[PDB]
Every structure is written in structure tokens, then in C-alpha cells.
């Protein structure tokens, strides 16, 4: 057997894999930055890795446009010429492959971020609807804020063993919430306090609010903040350009309607059309527009 | 008898009900957030509830387009099979109906915010005039900034009995204005000091100024500011996109005029037209424009 | 004799009166806010009051379009039935007329801000040129920032005799620059330190930077800052909308050129035009473009 | 011999001189602000000054358009009646000419900033490609942010020997990073700490984040910040106006495609086309578009 790329199954499967790419893009950077020194986030990662492997089996059993191609030999050779290498590197079980330090095993699973390429391959499906691309733009924005929160925590944390003597953002967080770092390294804020503050700071830098209770203080935090300001400005010229243009695309029926209504009303005022005739003109435009848009 | 939906009474009544929906959108969230534990606002809420009940009787005695339907049975069944459920729920006298704690009696009146649906139903009347839709957009911005100020006060206040040990924004307000909270729970800022500071903080986060004397410090305050940064950026792509478009629509006569003027001016440069002829061309453009628009 | 409204004298006089309106819009708010309790600014104000009086005499001797009307009686009655009242109220010298406290005598000169109406009447002269309207938009922004600096200092100063007990922005300025107010009310920042700080805070609020060393702290300063954030957002939808649109209008030759060049380039790529013919097409486009625009 | 201005050598040379102008725009303002009183930045400046002299010899031996002109006498007189004066002043070795204080000798090398004119002459070469004009816009922004960081350090540094008594931004930097100044007016932050903080402050002001741990405190720092807020708002109305327009210009193939797809989709909904015909319509649109754009 072989699966048609326009079938109602393969359409729903491509929309389901988007949610497992969004899951990967959230929980992989978080586990790589915050959690490194059954669990639901161990077994759900195993379930999700099995589905990203089943998607390789579906890619060996899908038709594709050259006219459609429907022979398993002409399907398999096209997947090997195309994306199979990137898809297999995104599927190696590195957690089972080596036992080789635990820091390397924790970091190396960031190779799963190659699963973001399974969205770039399929924008011809996902971008078709205005309400779907507006959701992808807000998830692109919230994921870029989350990835920068994981980098901002990695920067804030790596300056404690290469010790600063109480300058970097984690010491200031400890004081501001009344959970200070003791000189033994004991105490300090929880992973919720550190994550929520890092996400708050990077939405505050990207959306340009800059609240000034978290503020960058060491040179690596300042050089990171210059990079977040260069990313945030290119992104506001692009994402919140396209969200405004997509709202204007949905609103385009109303914008055209009021433009043609204003022309009809201005014509009616310029000629001072008598009421017995004017009502026939301004009712006809509403009828004709309601039929043909 | 029956009322025609285009009549000058029903037109003025639908513009009066916009001002009473704006009153409900202001003083209901304020009473639910700041005033929990006759007065002028206790009698004015009774007068306004009577007018929102009179508006239900008008909705049983108004015509609608199938042209118009003008039989009370065909009117009433259309209202029951439409908006009557929301309209009557938005008029239940919960201030009298139960005796059942006084906090819940005060909170349950927030069901009156269903009166905002009486504006969404009538955007065919309200959006027609450029100065009226520009007014609505500035009131949607000011009402969202006010509703967020009521949530920001509810968050800042509920963390005092869920005691924080002096971390949340109301303790910082007490120390900043020289009206501290005593350790006995006495003193602290007045309702004007707390409301004006809450409204100042939500305009500061929405317009992205971020003044840094009020800043979010506990995790619920930081999670709220992440939500206000997402609301504020979607609202700047939408409201201050549409306000700039309506400003350009009011400017459209001037924009067309200068665009046609530049074509005529460049034509007169390109052919180097002699003055006696140039004045005839360039005066004719001003007549033909100021006559025909 | 009588003066033609299109003459080179009346063109230069209308462009000179713009500079004396810009002078009035600067030095009247400043003298009313900062300098209350002959000099160079007193004699320049007298010279400028004489020129705004001479402009009333020119308005009694200028032609106007009904063809142009040139009889002095038909000119004078048209000016009296028009702007003469506002032009005379903007010219009555209340300072020289009076013989009742000197605070009111200094404040009453703010009637000179009616001279801003002598710009709004003449936008058909001033808005014609792209470099002139871009200058008017930047001076409208810099004058709105200056008028708000004068209101912000009037608020900050009135709360010292209506005493705050050391809360408002002037006490914090004293501590920050090392010029504290003494306990007797003696000393404190100079008029330069106070003005440059008030102008800095209002550019910081309007452009939304919010630097957080000056921040609003009493309720009148917070209510003013809410007003500046509503002014600043409507103004960024309008002024920095129109400045960007005028920059696009100045760029419109280059924008049309690249749009037609991209069409000709895309056509040449699609048909794979051989080089001997490619150069002829691609040069002819540049000749036809640079000749006719 | 003589060089044709469209040849692949002269194309590569004009793209190489853009990189040496970008190097000049970085390392000359930096050396003039931070380093006042062979190694890499002595020998690389010698190599680059020799290449800007070799470019003068190329400018005497290149063809130009009046139709092309190729006689060395008609080339040389066109360069002498054109840019040769600016190109010679941008190449005088003032460091070898004078032997009178060394502060002026170091500052006088800022004459090399006339090399920015060698980019402004050649925008007809560089602006042709959409990726190249987007790169020039981001480097124009990052170079304005760098030049303002050199002025901001010159202001912050000159008020230490013209002593402030502990007010300006460099004293605050020393206290924040754990490197306080000695009472002699000496020691404290390194050139990395001072440069990275100055560049962080000008991106913070230009992108309007305003982080509030660096803030202007003396009057020269406040007057500078008012100028940066006027430059930053004109620049965001112009540079990030153009970057968002260039992103929409690159996206114009997709924007035209989806607008034409939506017109076809709306037509197919309006007539309710049966599936055996509908597929042929929407498949033909995809063929016709992917063939001709």
C-alpha cells in the first residue's frame, strides 16, 4: 500500500506533527538549560520520539508531485535525495547510545531541534489559512522569547562557577524576592522563580518595555542584550509587520466595502440625489456587495 | 405599535446605549476589584439597569430585515431564537436575588459585562462614520487598560493575605508615596493612590514605556506582565494599525489631491510649459478638484 | 495701493511669520512656566509684537479669491467678518495695558498662543513642499514636547507650596544631581537643570524610552503621565505615520524605478533574452525612465 | 590602458571598497574616542590607507558615461571637476605631516570619515540587490549606534577632568560592576567595560528599550539623550520603514500569489463549482502562476 499526500489522513497527520514540533521546541531547550545538574517528561519524550520515527515510515510510504508519483522505489529514492538524512539525525536515541558524561548526554539531545525543519518543508500546507498563519506568527514569537530565556539563564548561571562576586542577574534576583544566595551556594531562587524571571526579561527586551528591575550588568549580559535588541527590531519589522498585514487581509472585505460605500455616498452627495431615488441606489449597493463581495 | 429600525428614535437610542455600555464597562470592573469587603453610584446603577431592561422591551417592538418584517409574533420569535438569552442574563437582579456571601453578591454582578455584546451586535450602525470609529478605538484602548488595572490590583492585593513578606507591588507603593503599611496591617495607600498607580502601570506596559518605579516582583505579577506584553503587542498591530488607517482615510482627500498635483506638476516641468498656458492648466486642476473631489 | 496674495513679497512675509510663530510657541510657554516671580527677551518680544501688529495692517491690504477681489472696502469687510477678532486678541498688549497681581499679568500673555492659528490658516502655502511639511512635522513634535515640559514643571512646582513632604520629581532631581533642597526650602536645582530635565522626561515619555531616573511619583504626576501616553500614542499613529509617508513620497521615484526594473528583469529572466538584445531592452528602460520620470 | 566600469574586476573592487569603508566607519571613531593619550591596528590601517590610495589611481583609469567616455584626458578632467578633492583629503597621511599636541594629531585622523562618500557615490551599484540593501540598512543602523557610543563615551569621559563631583555615567559604572574609581579620579572600569556599556546604552536608547541601569544624569548627558531620541525616532520612521518594506518586497511573490489564490477561491465559493471541474481550475492556477509569476 501507499498513502496519498492530499488524503484526509495525511492532512491530519501533518497538522498533528506541528503540535509535536511545538512540544519539542518548548521542552527540549528547557530541559537543556534549566534541568541539567516514571517522570511524565521522560515517558512523553519517548512517546514523541516514537511518533517522529513513525513519521519516517510514513515518508517512505507517501505519494509526491514530480504529476503524482506512486511507486515505492521512486518514493524511497526521492526521500534519500531529499530530507532523510536530517530526519534520521533528528531521530538517533542519544540517551541510549552512550553512558559519555551526563552533561554531554543532556546537551546532545538539543539535536532534536532539527525537527523544526519539518515545519519549513510544509509551509505550503500550514500558510494557506489566515487564522492558522496568525497562530504560527504568535507561536514563532513566544518560541523566540522562550529560546532567548534559556540562553539568558545559561549566561546568568555559567558566571556563578566562573565566579563574579555578586554582579550578575541571578544574585540580584535572589535579593529582590527575599531568597538570597548564601556564601556556601545554598538557598537562592527556585527553578520557577528563575525561569519565570528569564522569560519575563526576554519578553521585556523583545517587546521593548524594559522594566528595569531585571537589568543586564556583566559584559556577557550586555552583549547578549545588544543581540536581543538587534533580533527584536528585525522581528518587529517582520512578525508584527505580517500580523498587522494578516489582520488587514481578514479586514480587507470591510476595507473594500467602506471604500466603495464612501464612493457611492460621495457621488450621492455631489449630485444631491432625491430621497425616492437615493434609497434605491444605496440599497442596491448593499444587495450587490452582499452577493458578490 | 412597532418601531422601525432606521427611525431617528431608534438611531438615537442605539447611540445612547453605547454611552451606557461604556458606563458598565468602567464602573462594574472597578466595583468588583476595588470596593469589595443611597450612594450616587448605587442610584445611577439602578437607573442604568432600568434602561438596559427598557432596551429588552424595545427589542420585542423593533422591525428587522428578513426587506423588513413588521409582525410582533415574527419579531418576538426571532429575538428568542437569537440574542434574548444574553440580554436577559445581563439583567438578572443578583444584588437582590440571594442573601450567598456579600463578596459573592458583589462579584456575581460582573455578569453585567455581557452588555458589551450589545455593542458587537450594532457595528453596522457605529462603524459607518470615521470620527465615531476613531472614538471607539480610543475607548477600546482605554477600557482594556482599565480592565487590566483591575486585574493588576486583584493580583497585587490577593498576595497580602496569601502573605509574601513585603515583596508585591502594594508594599512598594506604600514605601514610595510615604504611606507605608504598618506590621499590624493598618495604614497603607488610599483607593485613589492604588487605582491611579494600577492604571498608570497598565498604560506604562501597554504603550511600552515601562517607567521602572512600579515593576512586577512576585511570580504572579511577572506572569501577568508576560500576558500584558502579548495583549499590548497584538493590540498595537490592531488598534494603532486601524487608528493610523482611519487617520489616513480622513486624510485621503489630501493624499489624492497631492498625488494628482504631483503628476500635473511633473508634467508641467517635463514639457516646460509657458506661464500664460501654465496658469490655465494649474488653475483648472484646482477648479476640477474642488468641484468633483 | 493693495498687495497681491500670490506676490513674491507676500510669499516671503508668510514664510517669515512662520518663524515668528515658532518663536512665540517656544518663548511664551517658557516665560509663563519658568520665569514667573529692557531685557534682551523683553525687547525681542516687543519687536515681534510689532511685527504681528504690522501683519494685521497687511491683512487689511491683501487681495483674496471670491477671480481675486481688490477693492479695499471688500477686503476690509471680509477680514472683519473673518479672522480679525482672533488676530486682535493675539495682539492686545495686556502687559502694557494694565495699571491685578503681577502673576496674572505674566500668565495673561499666554493669549499670544492664538498666533498658532496664523499657521493653521495658511497650510495651502506651507504644505506644498515635501521638505517644508517634513520640517513642520518635526517642529510640531519638538513643540509638543516643549509644551508638555512646561506643564510638567508647572505640576512639579505647584506641589512644593501645596507641600508634598518630599515625594515629587523636583526633590528627587535635587538628590540625583547633588543639589538637594535645604530644610528651609533654600537651594535646589537651577532653571537649566529643571528645564533640561523636564524636556528630557517628556521626550522620554513621548518616544516611549522611559529611562526611569525621572519617574512620576505623586498622583498628579501619574495622571499627567497617563495623559502623555495617550497623546504620545495618537501622535505616533499620526506624526511618525506622516513623516514615514512623506519619506516614502520623496522615495517614490526610486520606488517606482525599482518596481518597473524588477518587472523588466523578471521578464528578461523568464524569456531568457540573449545579451545583445538584453542590453538594448535594459538600457532603453533607463533612457525612457530618466527622460520622462 | 583603461578599465571598463561595468567589468567584473571593477564590480568586485567596488564591493571590496564597501568593506574597507565599513572598517573605516568602525575603527576610526573607536580610535578617536577610546584610545587617545607594527601592531595589528597600525599595520591594517597602513594596508587599508594604501588601498584607498590605489582606488584614486583606479578612479583616474576608469571609463564613465557622458554614452561611454574613454580618453584619459576626458576621464581625468571629469574626476578633478568631481570627487577628487574629497578623495584626496580622505587620503592625506596627517600622522606623518605634523610633529601641535598629540590629542589633536589623534583626533585629526577622523578626516578618514570622508570615505563614507565613496559609498554614497555608488548606491546605483549597491541598491540593485534586495539582500544587499537590507544588509546596508542593518549596517547603517549598527554604525549609527556605534558612532553615538563614541560620542557618549567622549561626553562621559570629558566631565571627569572637568570634574562633576561624582554625578556622570562613568562613576555609576564603576560602582555597579564592582570596580569603583579611586579618590584620585583614576582606575576603575576597563576599555571593554566602558565600550560595551556605551554601545549597550545607545542601542537601548535607539531601539527605545531604556533599561534604566545606565541613565543620563548631568545636563550634557540629558541634552545628548534628547538628540538620540530625535535621531532614533527619525531613524525608526526611515531605516525600519525601509527594512519592513524590503521584507514585503522579497515576500511580494508570495503576497501576489495568495491574493490571486484568494480571488480564485472566492470565485469558486460564489459559483459552488463541482469537484471534477474545481480541481482543474485550482490546479491550472498553480501551473500558470509557477510558470510565469
UniProtKB/Swiss-Prot annotation, chains A, B, C, D:
Effect of residue 193 to H: In LQT2; uncertain significance
Sugar-modified residues: 182
Phenotype upon changing residue 240 to C: In LQT2; uncertain significance
Impact when changing residue 156 to V: In LQT2; uncertain significance
Tissue expression as described in the entry: Highly expressed in heart and brain. Isoforms USO are frequently overexpressed in cancer cells.
Transmembrane segments: 7-27, 40-60, 82-100, 105-125, 132-152, 223-243
Effect noted on mutating residue 213 to Q: Abolishes cell surface expression; has no effect on N-glycosylation
Result when mutating residue 193 to G: In LQT2; uncertain significance
Consequence when changing residue 210 to A: In LQT2; uncertain significance
Extracellular-side positions: 101-104, 153-195, 217-222
Effect after changing residue 55 to Y: In LQT2; uncertain significance
Effect in UniProt of substituting residue 62 to N: In LQT2; uncertain significance
Outcome of mutating residue 30 to C: In LQT2; uncertain significance
Cytoplasmic side: 61-81, 126-131
Effect of residue 177 to K: In LQT2; uncertain significance
Induction remarks: Up-regulated by RNF207 (at protein level).
Signal peptide range in chain numbering: none
Effect caused by changing residue 65 to I: In LQT2; uncertain significance
Effect on the protein of changing residue 76 to T: In LQT2; bradycardia-induced
Family the entry assigns: Belongs to the potassium channel family. H (Eag) (TC 1.A.1.20) subfamily. Kv11.1/KCNH2 sub-subfamily.
Assembly behavior: The potassium channel is probably composed of a homo- or heterotetrameric complex of pore-forming alpha subunits that can associate with modulating beta subunits. Interacts with DNAJB12 and DNAJB14; chaperones DNAJB12 and DNAJB14 promote tetramerization. Heteromultimer with KCNH6/ERG2 and KCNH7/ERG3. Interacts with ALG10B. Forms a stable complex with KCNE1 or KCNE2, and that this heteromultimerization regulates inward rectifier potassium channel activity. Interacts with CANX. The core-glycosylated, but not the fully glycosylated form interacts with RNF207.
Function: Pore-forming (alpha) subunit of voltage-gated inwardly rectifying potassium channel. Channel properties are modulated by cAMP and subunit assembly. Characterized by unusual gating kinetics by producing relatively small outward currents during membrane depolarization and large inward currents during subsequent repolarization which reflect a rapid inactivation during depolarization and quick recovery from inactivation but slow deactivation (closing) during repolarization.
Notes concerning its domains: The S4-S5 linker acts as a signal integrator where it both couples voltage-sensor domain (VSD) movement to pore opening and closure, as well as providing a binding site for other domains that regulate activation and/or deactivation of the channel.
Official protein name in the record: Voltage-gated inwardly rectifying potassium channel KCNH2
Organism: Homo sapiens (Human)
The gene coding this protein: KCNH2
